[PDB]
């Protein structure tokens, strides 16, 4: 089997790159992401829109309530090995994502050491300013009110109802920022999606800066995959 590994920092265009290869080849893409396995934060966690898949398939390693905690990395790694192992008859698969703890498991795992052909692509963080520009547009996309999917702020207000979701979302990019932003301005979290004209802009810029923080960590902690 051919495994087309696309990894790299947040807001690097990885997902679209993967969808395009998947349109051409017909192969599924397995999301190398733990946080995307909670569909209740589909939007904030980066899941492509159903419209954006262009009819390609995108495979998550689990589907789990947020309050069950984010999928741990060794469990996600067991799962990934299984989604690849039972498709072993197929020409190729696309593995795309930015999970730091999960890429590190793949790099320690003997499973990948043997038995596959590979095309490996590592996307890198650009200049920070260009990064923040892409980040801010991404966040505004995740903030847009559509008919077909809850916004980030809507996902957050829904879950804030459940006290056990609170600690968990405080450890997730975007959400952590949005929560801190609410307390900073004395806003109920319920209120974030009604927020004045130019406070929308502060919050977007604040999240983008949390995304770049994360992308810096990804660049530090990522494995160096051989290619
Ligand atoms: N898709 C995602 N969306 C939001 N935050 C994420 C995402 N993936 C990782 N994180 C953050 O980075 C830490 C996850 O570690 P990892 O999966 O090992 O990169 C999480 O604890 C979140 O704080
Ligand atoms: C880490 C966050 C906020 C979203 C996950 S999707 P990504 O950000 O890994 O994706 P792209 O490189 O934009 O496809």
UniProtKB/Swiss-Prot annotation:
| Catalytic activity annotation | dimethylallyl diphosphate + AMP = N(6)-(dimethylallyl)adenosine 5'-phosphate + diphosphate
Q: Which UniProt keywords apply?
A: Crown gall tumor, Cytokinin biosynthesis, Plasmid, Transferase
Query: What InterPro entries does its record include?
Result: P-loop_NTPase, Tzs
Give GO MF terms, alphabetically. AMP dimethylallyltransferase activity
Query: What Enzyme Commission number(s) does the record list for this chain?
Result: 2.5.1.27
Broad EC category: transferase
Name a Pfam family for this protein: IPT
- Keyword Magnesium annotated: no
Query: Tell me, which GO biological process terms does this entry list?
Result: cytokinin biosynthetic process
- What is the documented function of this protein? Transfers dimethylallyl groups to AMP as part of the biosynthesis of cytokinin phytohormones.
| UniProt-recorded name of the protein | Adenylate dimethylallyltransferase
What organism is this sequence from?
Agrobacterium fabrum (strain C58 / ATCC 33970)
């Amino acid at each position: 089997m051919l495994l087309h590994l696309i990894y790299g920092p947040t807001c690097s265009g990885k997902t679209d790159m993967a969808i395009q290869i998947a349109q051409e080849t017909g192969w599924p893409v397995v999301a190398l992401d733990r946080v995307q396995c909670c569909p209740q934060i589909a939007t904030g966690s980066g899941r492509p829109l159903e419209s954006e898949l262009q009819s390609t398939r995108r495979i998550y390693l689990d589907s789990r309530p947020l309050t069950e905690g984010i999928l741990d990395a060794e469990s996600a790694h067991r799962r990934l090995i299984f989604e690849v192992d039972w498709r072993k008859s197929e020409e190729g698969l696309i593995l795309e994502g930015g999970s730091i703890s999960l890429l590190n498991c793949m790099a320690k795992s003997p499973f990948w050491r043997s038995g596959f052909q590979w095309h490996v692509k590592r996307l890198r963080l650009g200049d920070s300013d260009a990064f923040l520009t892409r980040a801010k547009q991404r966040v505004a996309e995740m903030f847009a009110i559509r008919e077909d999917r809850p916004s980030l702020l809507e996902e957050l207000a829904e879950l804030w109802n459940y006290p056990a979701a609170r600690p968990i979302l405080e450890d997730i990019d975007g959400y952590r920022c949005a929560i801190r932003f609410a307390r900073k301005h004395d806003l109920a979290i319920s209120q974030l999606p009604n927020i004045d004209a130019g406070r929308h802009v502060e919050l977007i810029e604040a999240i983008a800066n949390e995304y770049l923080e994360h992308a810096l960590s990804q660049e530090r902690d990522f494995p160096q995959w051989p290619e």
